[PDB]
């Protein structure tokens, strides 16, 4: 029994073996398959913040392989301990490059997906990464929460892209035409709406002139209601897709993404830690914004009577372990 019984446990060929001398033989043919390339070295950078930047492959040999014909010879959530309500103290803090955010009560904080291993970069260059500026916590628009929002209202500040903007955005990027309309905006794509409102910041200075960019993102929202308010929020941090394919007026199964309910009962705060998910090592600048941050309402907050109906909140967004590759003339975006 050699090279037989492939993709066991099922009556089908699962391509268990990428290649065998046996498959594709003249006598018999199986389905084809593939194997990993190992494009030798390159500044091994892929997902933050595991990127070492040191190239495993020898540098400058440029050996080549085939012999040229013109040369003669060459060579948690566990029920063991339950987090108390916001009455109890339970301190916590989440820092960053310089700015930091204290909190009381219980702060749900998670790391959405575990950090993947590094992979050799296709291009050969040294990435230029800036310590803060371009780190710390940048404050996006402070959005107002209102009582009249029903379930799944997609509340957002002044820096978000409008619903119809999520389709037919146009060129190039911000035209100010899709960002200003009656009733807006549904949500902010993370790469595009961060540069907006922060051209001065170095991260902003970069990502214009550097072409491909690499960043992991972490988003943090802070809502403190009085001990008597009741409500909830969700932070989806949806990976790239049109809203129409992602969610339409339903949001019922939408917990498959990262979520971290705010739940104004026991919590003042929520964070998310997201490694960046994009095809190819580095996305191109000025296009292809991979993460989009939605903020939704599970239950309408009904405030204590005789007190103001509105309630206020802010959103803190920051990069993690940024990098860039390649230079060019400045591009607006």
């Amino acid at each position: 029994t050699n090279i037989y019984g492939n993709g066991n446990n099922v009556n089908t060929d699962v391509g268990a073996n990428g290649w065998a001398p046996t498959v594709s033989t003249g006598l018999g043919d199986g389905p084809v398959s593939c194997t990993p390339p190992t494009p030798s070295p390159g500044d091994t950078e892929v997902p933050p913040p595991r990127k070492p930047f040191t190239f495993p492959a020898p540098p400058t040999k440029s050996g080549s392989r085939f012999s040229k014909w013109w040369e003669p010879a060459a060579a948690p959530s566990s029920t063991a301990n339950p987090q108390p309500s916001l009455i109890a103290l339970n301190p916590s803090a989440t820092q960053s490059g310089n700015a930091s955010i204290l909190t009381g009560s219980t702060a749900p904080s998670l790391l959405a997906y575990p950090t993947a291993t590094p992979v050799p970069l296709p291009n050969p260059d040294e990435p230029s990464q800036p310590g803060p500026s371009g780190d710390r916590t940048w404050l996006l628009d402070t959005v107002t929460w209102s009582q009249e929002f029903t379930r799944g209202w997609n509340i957002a500040g002044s820096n978000g892209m409008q619903w119809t903007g999520l389709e037919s955005l146009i060129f190039p990027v911000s035209t100010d035409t899709n960002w200003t309309s009656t009733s807006s905006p549904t949500a902010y794509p993370l790469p595009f709406s961060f540069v907006r409102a922060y051209p001065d910041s170095s991260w902003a200075a970069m990502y214009n002139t550097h072409s491909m960019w690499n960043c992991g993102w972490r988003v943090q929202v802070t809502v403190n209601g009085s001990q008597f308010h009741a409500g909830a929020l969700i932070l989806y941090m949806v990976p790239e897709a049109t809203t129409h394919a992602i969610q339409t007026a339903r949001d019922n199964a939408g917990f498959v993404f990262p979520y971290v309910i705010l739940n104004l009962y026991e919590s003042n705060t929520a964070t998310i830690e997201v490694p960046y998910i994009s095809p190819t090592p580095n996305t191109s600048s000025g296009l292809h914004a991979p993460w989009t941050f939605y903020l939704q309402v599970l239950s309408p907050l009904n405030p204590p009577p005789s007190l103001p109906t509105s309630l206020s909140c802010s959103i803190y967004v920051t990069p993690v372990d940024s990098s860039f590759h390649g230079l060019r003339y400045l591009a607006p975006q």
Binding site: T12, P76, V260, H288
Partner: protein, 253 residues
């Protein structure tokens, strides 16, 4: 066990953290025991079976291309989702953003007119310029197949296409542009598995050319899917209202 317990531990917890705890509570008088997982759940076993894809931008299941003209049959996983049905291969891949597999097509086509015929099926690896009007000589360099089709109808054929994309992972949804200057928003033409261009032929070359009709089954293999998304909506059952609560949860009472 022990039956009556004064001190038994509570079932309370917190679901606010992203992680959700699904372990069974140790209730008294209950012996909870794990179960082996039957191997219909794993992806690479579940996607190795053939399913029917919706053809073209819309108007599934079948495509009808008139004779003498080839159809390019785009394999973009982004084109399938457009006009995609609630149930089918179409909407199952909507659960994952990125997929990598060697896509195995089996296509069948039935010629209504009665003469035997031959289709010439070619695979243009992504990306590759598809000739605007294909010719037998030009179409042929790529890769060849000669499908004799029975005169009455229904002649099948299968194929095995390795994973050629340079994207490493092909997106099933892409938010951004393709061309630097141009528009083409919301899709990428270079992430996919080639295109199948196929040019019919008739030796008799009789009048009343007519139109061939086809449909194809597609089953991935050695499958990998990197990040999940929520599955598409399924229309719920109607409320009988005669005797409710038998099925369909009641609420708001």
């Amino acid at each position: 066990t022990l039956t009556e317990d004064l001190d038994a531990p509570q079932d309370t917890g917190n679901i606010e953290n992203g992680a959700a705890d699904n372990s069974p509570q140790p209730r008294t008088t209950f012996d909870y025991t794990g179960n082996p997982l039957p191997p219909d759940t794993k992806l690479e076993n579940f996607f190795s079976f053939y399913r029917l894809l919706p053809m073209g931008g819309s108007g599934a299941p079948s495509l009808s291309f008139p004779a003498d003209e080839g159809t390019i049959i785009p394999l973009d996983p982004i084109n399938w989702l457009k006009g995609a049905d609630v149930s089918g291969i179409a909407a199952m891949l909507s659960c994952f953003t990125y997929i990598a597999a060697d896509l195995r097509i089996t296509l069948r086509f039935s010629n209504p007119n009665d003469n035997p015929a031959t289709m010439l099926v070619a695979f243009a690896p992504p990306g590759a310029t598809i000739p605007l009007k294909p010719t037998r000589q030009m179409l042929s360099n790529f890769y060849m197949a000669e499908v004799p089709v029975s005169a009455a109808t229904s002649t099948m054929v299968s194929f095995s296409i390795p994973y050629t994309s340079p994207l490493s992972a092909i997106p099933t949804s892409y938010f951004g542009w393709e061309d630097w200057s141009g528009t083409n928003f919301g899709q990428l033409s270079s992430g996919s598995w080639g295109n199948l261009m196929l040019i019919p032929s008739l030796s008799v070359d009789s009048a009343i050319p007519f139109d061939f009709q086809l449909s194809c089954w597609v089953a991935f293999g050695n499958f990998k899917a990197w990040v999940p998304r929520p599955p598409p909506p399924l229309p719920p059952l109607p409320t009988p209202a005669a005797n409710a609560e038998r099925t369909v949860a009641v609420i708001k009472q």
